[PDB]
Design a protein around this ligand. Sequence first.
Ligand SMILES: Nc1ncnc2c1ncn2[C@@H]1O[C@H](COP(=O)(O)OP(=O)(O)OC[C@H]2O[C@H](O)[C@H](O)[C@@H]2O)[C@@H](O)[C@H]1O
Length: 507
Amino acid sequence: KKWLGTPIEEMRRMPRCGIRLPLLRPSANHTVTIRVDLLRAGEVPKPFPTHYKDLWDNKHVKMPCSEQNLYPVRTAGSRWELIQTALLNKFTRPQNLKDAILKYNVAYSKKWDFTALIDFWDKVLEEAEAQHLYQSILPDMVKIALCLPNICTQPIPLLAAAMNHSITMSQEQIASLLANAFFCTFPRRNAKMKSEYSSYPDINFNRLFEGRSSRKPEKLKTLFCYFRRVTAAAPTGLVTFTRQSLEDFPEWERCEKPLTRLHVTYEGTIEENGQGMLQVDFANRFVGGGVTSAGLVQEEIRFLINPELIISRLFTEVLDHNECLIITGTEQYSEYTGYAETYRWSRSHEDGSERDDWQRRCTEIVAIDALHFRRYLDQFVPEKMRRELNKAYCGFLRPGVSSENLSAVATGNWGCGAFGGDARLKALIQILAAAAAERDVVYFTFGDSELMRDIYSMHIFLTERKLTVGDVYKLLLRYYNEECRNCSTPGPDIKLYPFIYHAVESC
Ligand SMILES: Nc1ncnc2c1ncn2[C@@H]1O[C@H](COP(=O)(O)OP(=O)(O)OC[C@H]2O[C@H](O)[C@H](O)[C@@H]2O)[C@@H](O)[C@H]1O
């Protein structure tokens, strides 16, 4: 009664069900920022190339340490030198850190509020904790940030719209980049009226420091736990970020594949109970959502407990309808309680995930953004349903991997919270997309036992009647036509699942 359907023990998991990884190597579609010949378990990766190479152009990250990162001083000065002078001062009071960050962000000295930072340091932390923050954690964060040019020696390409491309970098490289984001050093990522990066998420952390939300101290404690850990002892693994764009989507009405298997449960979570499975991130199209600002639901929580996810925001352009982002190897650094306005940092987490042959933790997460529905009936429009199917399919599909090497998809109430979707429709949409990609589904209803029973009952009804993906999608089209298209009322007369049962049983 806590779970229904296929036992979870019968589902596929990594590393055990994967194909042997090819040799890690750079190519036209795979950027690798470390020495693959020198990659060894338990050893910090050596950057490749050995010495910094800079690109300052429209296809790459604009690094803070670039010699083309200038500031009008009536003449040009080196912003990297300015950052060095600003950050290498000792901090004893939160005003010190604010003044430091603003030295190289002068145009934002009246726009960026630091109230949350000041309050965290002065009004949440005990004296000993504040002292540890400014005597140890912050100066260590400064040093790894300022080592950037020795750590990230290779230009990082932007994962731009329509690119099918991967970047594999070390956890150490990510820590240095994230310390930079914390100190707000990334240029051209700040103007509200910016052109080049308007289609990219926020990366600099300035909005984490604003206002008086009671959740800011919990975000900051979660992030400082990470920074403490990665500056005290350099992490040794790698992380891969892959942008995936599909060209041909299924003719859904015509799909003759059968449904796959389902485990559905009202207990557990994606991140704890989906080990070795493709874990779904219920994303915003600007990946990470409000992680560095006010957001604190499913995506922001995952980005906080696995902060290596946050660096996706540096190089991942806003997802189009046919796109996703697949992140392999992020490490869990914190545990938490609650959710949204009750979210709290609990303690440091020791990740026991095994690493694959590329020294990546065996944790695969896919960012797929649902549509945000403002009116209930909107989501039943065929175009919108087909959009959600194609999005999930893109997230689930692994071109040229066979089904027996695909783990189950660990998912849940995608789009049915901040984004207003109907869980029962979305559940069926995910089940169809999983079918077409030939993966099983492990579905966590996050405490809703009725929804568990309902998803289970519908799935077994459809499976026992041998209804194909196409048969089911056609029933969704019928529901729209009979109950939604000509409905002038906000909510239809008959619900989806009852409609389906009656339509199938009536034929
Ligand atoms: N750990 C979890 N495991 C399983 N299910 C979960 C978990 N956490 C939450 N749920 C369930 O999943 C439901 C939906 O989680 P939501 O986070 O609202 O995702 P959306 O797709 O609707 O909104 C995405 C936007 O919100 C963010 O800001 C993004 O950046 C986007 O801007 C919850 O109501 C729970 O029932």
